[model samples]
Target chain A: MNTVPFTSAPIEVTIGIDQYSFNVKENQPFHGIKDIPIGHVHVIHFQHADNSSMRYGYWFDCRMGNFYIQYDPKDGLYKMMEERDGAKFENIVHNFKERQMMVSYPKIDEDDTWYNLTEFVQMDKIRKIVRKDENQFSYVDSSMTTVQENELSDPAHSLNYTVINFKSREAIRPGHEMEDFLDKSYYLNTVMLQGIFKNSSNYFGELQFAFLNAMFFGNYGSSLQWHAMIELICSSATVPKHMLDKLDEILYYQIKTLPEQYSDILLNERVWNICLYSSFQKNSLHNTEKIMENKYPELL
Target chain B: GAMNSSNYAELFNNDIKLFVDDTNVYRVTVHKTFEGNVATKAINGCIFTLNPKTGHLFLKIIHTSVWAGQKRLSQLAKWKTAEEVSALVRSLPKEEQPKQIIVTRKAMLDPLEVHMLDFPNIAIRPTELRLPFSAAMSIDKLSDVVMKATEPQMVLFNIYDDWLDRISSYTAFSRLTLLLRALKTNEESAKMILLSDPTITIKSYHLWPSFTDEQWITIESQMRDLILTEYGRKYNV
Candidate 1:
């Protein structure tokens, strides 16, 4: 006797539940006045499988005095009819910007589940990791590296971001000095500035700026009229200017190398958002990481 | 290096208040109005300057209604840089330029800092400008504030923040990519701050994560293509 192998072919089919495309009659009268409803809208939904079935409730029902036009069901729902052929027979408008429609489907809810159909409507948006090269739209992959290996990525980099918020009154607005001792000293002391710096791994570097921006502008508003209030109070300025100057002189400002052990810690840490002078305790706080972590413990 | 940050607590506390107190400064408020119906938000930049020599608060306001448009991720309107303000100053008749001006410099790598370098004569002061509880504002209020601060010293004037909780993680990633790309390609040699580490260390502040890595990858690739197409379409490149 010959035995045959049995294979099960799983089959799946999805039918759009009462998908609709209706035109507000051209010259559709609103109240006594003969008016035209003019608007273009494209909406998408991601919902439980059965949510579409329940959508025929009061949400889709026509209100009093609302005019609705009849159209071919195939063209209305799926645009099954083409422009060249039975398109004119269809009343649905398919202009791109003027008008257009698209229907998409994702997976659905499991059987024997109590799901809120109303809450499921919020799930209708096509939310994704979208990008714009210019005017065009595109999606982005999380691991995909758009930045090439360049100077920015190089470990042997010389680029420095230097700012001396409150220089002397006589200091030139834009100083032209070529790598002066003071400049070198400022960079040396601050770059991987050790004493205050602390370690934490969960910081999202982009958020530091956003959060600081919010902290300064969001809650406080105009109380901080002078930028110096925050910058000077929170930064290396807290350390006496003379102290850094002393280090510069003693260490000769020769890129006062932070100990090699600090390489891993410093690389992982961010110093910019740490508002040292805030009402919080500085010793326990150590860095902005603690402050942010405290404020939004869930994120970290 | 091991010294506690608090050991020098007096350094931060005792001296800085007087330093900030002495300087006479005015507020330049930028209000971003968000409308639920429309996709684009309107931005208004208002300038209010205080003269140190004299105790006069001078007001000049200008409005740039269309900013980044629907691409805005944050609820806050994009604020104009000090560079743009200088351009506004230049646009006015020569008589109107204020000897000094102040703005909100929220970040170390603000474009205003780099651009302010070009204008040596104007006393440009970038302050830490803020809003009331950082609340969502309206255009009428923004305009009203400008109208209320209407003393323009015989000239006219004008003039925004969003942190997070306004967008999704994927959206944040997209925004980060765009911001980094802009910085990378910028003609102005920026401070080159790495906005964030590549590792997904921070959970998105707003929405909970749902998509798989593979899904995000596909979304990103599709988004990249869409952006490229949009770039060509927008610039006709």
Candidate 2:
């Protein structure tokens, strides 16, 4: 559910927002820790951040190496913030030249959910909505008390995912004032602009970038290159195993949202191999009520 | 989008004189050594073939060897893009002395209406029928399984955790899913049949790109029959 007025602000400074974590318990109320002392926002783990206490979920796949940049109002220089634990985004030591760090987490928590840390500038805003009419809807901006829907289970009161793809999507790229409008995701993070989508030894960044391109299913060699990348990702001995599964889930969850035929081209053997014999996982594709959950009911 | 593709081969003799006309495809072939113990007639012109479908003359020169290309450009490579195919044809002409001669699939838009509008000789046209992008996609994946034998020439397809045949066999799956499963099943014996003989070849299929019209209908009967017998149609759901 979205909890906002949708804005042209960096998620860190974007205020009055509320959303659920991927780990948000079923039927539990999720309210972000309103007064975080370190940074201004919470980036919930897309898959496994412990939301036991209902963490605010701007659910993110950390492999993208994107961290919220909080402005140093007094010095006038911006700083990068990373989630060391929980919804906490603390300033981490880094060089401007190499802004991305190879982020890893303790597996003991069963929530080492980082994979293909993609620069998703879209999921940045979540807003609650109010019905204008049977044909119209708008986000809840503030304390305006209005007629609530008579429907008993009106989710319109909770967070509604604002700006979902088709519902719309964009990204982190370089451009000046004139060219930047090409980015459909955001104009500028007033905190400043640009999020570095880097490459890596584990090929996570490449995977993320390629996955981003491959998802479009256009561009020559876009898919085979992506398919080859995942093959390497799976064949890697350096990365943790479960993280691979999480990456696979990430693909399933994203692909699930597409029109079913798209899967035949984008879905490759490596991802298919990962799904074999594993417990079936479910992913909500973007904003669709439909779920993509596939398996052979009877074994051959 | 299963478009029927066909090609004419083995034209030699005065028929070799057929290419001595103004055409897009230019070629240089050597005559047999003769007269005064020297090579005979030296000719320069592209070959011509009559379209089997429309009975029109078209320039057709089979590159005997994939000479000017990089090694990967040698063996039946589907190019990175159609424009890339245009450039390669724009280059140097190789003699009959190259290492690899190749057959390639050119980029066709709208797999449904794919056509080779340029062939002549009604008996010589080889159509690249409508091979749907989805089915074409599976052929790449299918060739993976098939070539894994040149490398399941059968076992590769059994219902292991990794095989997609199971996904296709499930009748409840979506349209493309079932189409691919049938293609997968067909590609198996399809390859089996291809390896068993040399004369028979697959031009394309009714749905996917594995067998021909007469072959797919026959192969298709077995596709449904497999579920009925081997899997006992027990998992048809």
Candidate 3:
């Protein structure tokens, strides 16, 4: 049987459970007023047969003014997070930046098998043997692969993904990296990444860049300020420089391998989600001091 | 050699017989259409051949059966080198020639080695066990299934598919097939009872994460009972 790797807009919307497509009447709009609207973003929940629980995702883009139109939680909301300037509001909005796109197809079965895209470096490899005999047995070994130092700083990182979050405040201004990373459009391609992920209107090339523009400026809000604390720790001079580099390498590997591995089985994108999920988890646990206090003590 | 597996099938066709001497070791043998092709072909045409070396069952059958029988027999012996068994067949006369020979690896290793490696127990689920690598692959596939569920209901559906897939992947056809059919029948009937009674939950249902242990076990038991009733008894052959 064909595996259903990822779901997106129109298709998920076709399903009765399109969480993002709910009418204003059912879930009720976000209640707060202008400047801080309370309109709800579209949401979709996933559950697996292993009796594991369900996971939730949303589909709303405040930066582009497509905030309340229905979207597929699977395809739509993730698009906004990846391609749009959604990461600025990520922590507060519960939206995350899309890391990278790793599309794969196993020879046995192929339908539309594009997995979520994520990129992170790793510490080492992991391996296991499946079959064995007196002489030979089959085994699987996986480990974190390394990249050149700070390769992410170069825009070439944008080939598959836009890497941001490391610029110094004096050098350029802190928020712009998040904006660059959040910018949905590739510089050369110019369409926002979010629109392509959500792809509701077929804006394609133009959309990635448009979202890229917004990622730079439009979505600068509170959560990002709070979010910066974690990024700051990783990139900041306050922590030991060597330790920071180690964290980057560890986290990179953590992102690349963990999710799907943690899962009885994890697809590539799911593995990326594991990184995203854990990053949030790590930040949330340390939110009180490392983030809320150290970075944005003013808000506290 | 051009070989036929029909004779090998005959080896197992006979009732299995076992003899235990003073030693703890047990000797088992029975008529079989050579469970393996190579073995059967080795003693083909000649009604039977006996060895003073070991008072074991005579190796005699059509070359076709001999070929197939060699395989099944090899499962109980030590693995041999390439075309190694061909050397043994050389001892027989020209008339004993099996039509054709199948080039296949021999499972000639001692059974104890399998146990030493913990091959039998290492399989994730006993219901359908394979070697370690195969088991890992199966588990990997199941994990992927769980990941694909879009929602809670889909999760349940995928879980159901997992069970069915396991059953399909590891089951033998014929008798085992009939038993599974019967089990399904019993499960349906028991489900009706639980549905109407409401008090008794099935035991196996609890295996699902969605259900509490108590509730799931209640459901699971009912389902298991259904399965056991139809195909509970299985033979190695």
Candidate 4:
């Protein structure tokens, strides 16, 4: 229903097509579910270039790889991950030459190194960290400052911060630096983003798990990272409006009013809810706030 | 006399195999001994080189209580009283003992001397009696020995038996024995009528709790599982 450019929001995208590229079949059996066929109704072929050029290709690539659309049908739609290595997508758009980022948390100080949180940090670096490698890429990096919200107009902000930290040696070039850089930065971002998604997945299942993860933590990779998605919105928008608004209608109603009844759905939510729910008989569904809430208690 | 380093080397160089076991006190092995180093008693005795040059049984022991572990013999294992082991050894006059000088010293060796023994190629760590029992026994053993018995006396033997099982040991039967004992006893002990024992000081120990055979097995299985999973480490079993 809503058509936003793939290059906008939290994660940026660009598109192109290869007659002979990814092992991905044009139409194939969906990953988890059996009956449905998988296709990127809107296919997006990507350029393995820098963030600037890659932004243009975002739409096409987003169409082909992740996003899905359907003409009204009797059965309903299914959701699933594109059979592509996330690292490959990141490699295509990441800026290797020079990039910079600043990390800050509520209690922590501002960080100079792109990966440092300066204050609070996440523990599971391995799973949380991700690298969206590419020659060109664009991401939203919001700054949480106390000043008036007027100065926060920039959406595609500090997603590009550069540093040669202890882990990143200049000699390693695009190979080591590119991969490791995304890893460390994404890990920190994922935790923060997941926290947000967790709170929301709790508040709403209206958001798709994979999409929710992508919105918040999509930068790390395509896995659910709701925290980053909200940060992107926050950097450019207002509070309750962005929080309540970003969610799909069903989740909005549940989280907005009946938080108790939907708690189970929120707790059991995953990063791949769209595909999971596609199989269910019931049509009425809400955001996966229960899954988010379940995880949040443990994290805190 | 204790052999000097040089002489001890020469003595050890001689071929020998020693067996160490005694019903009480202690038991172990030795590298060498000088002539007449062993003391003698008509009741119990120590074996030693009869002469340094000839290396013969210069003397024998009449009675003595010696302390020992897996190492060498000492006087401490007698629970401090030397006469303790001496009288026990003398009491077992008919028990078989090897004749070789080294073997004889070893035959005199007993578990009481050392809990575990070490050899040139292998090392054996001494184990406590309670250790074997503890593996199978629950917390109740520490507080309630009588009540603890209704369960396998040998089944859940000790932490070490459980440890050995993880390391691929085949001789964990003793531990199994205790488990079975506890299981069998628990069934019947549950039905025994409470009677005041003259020595009973605690109120809890007096009453025998009721338990069915199935309940006993369930308790035993749960506890054994905890021991096996928690301390056992490996999962081959």
Against the true structure, what is every candidate's RMSD?
A: 32.9, 22.4, 28.3, 26.7
Ranking by lDDT: 2, 1, 4, 3
Q: Can you write out model 4's per-residue Cα lDDT over B1-237, one digit (the tens) per residue?
A: 222333333333333312121222222334334674654221122322121112121122213322212223343332222222222233333332112222112222332122111111222122212212211122233224322333222111132212332422222323333453443344233212111233322234221223334543554455455445534444455
DockQ of 2: 0.02
Against the hidden reference, what TM-scores do the models get? 0.21, 0.25, 0.17, 0.21
RMSD, model 4, all Cα superposed? 26.7
- Residues A134-241, candidate 2: write the lDDT tens digits: 221122221222122121144444322111111011321222211222222242221112332221322343344334433432322335445544443333223444
Residue B120, model 4, lDDT: 19
Judging by TM-score against the true structure, name the best candidate.
2
- What candidate 2 gets wrong by more than 4 Å, as runs, is A1-112, A115-267, A270-300, B4-54, B62-237
Q: Which TM-score value belongs to model 1?
A: 0.21
| lDDT, candidate 4, at B130 | 25
> lDDT, candidate 3, residue A256?
36
When just chain B is superposed on the true chain B, each candidate scores a TM-score of 0.29, 0.21, 0.19, 0.24
lDDT of each: 0.27, 0.29, 0.25, 0.26
Backbone clashes per model, in order?
31, 38, 98, 121
- Report how far residue B105 has shifted in candidate 1, in Å: 5.5
Model 3 chain B: lowest-lDDT 10 consecutive positions: B17-26
lDDT string for model 2 (B1-237, tens) is: 111322223221112211111121222344556454543221222222221122122222223232244343312122222122222222325331112111212322211011111111111122343322223223433323322332101111111121233332122122233344555445464334333445554333222333434764564465556434535444665
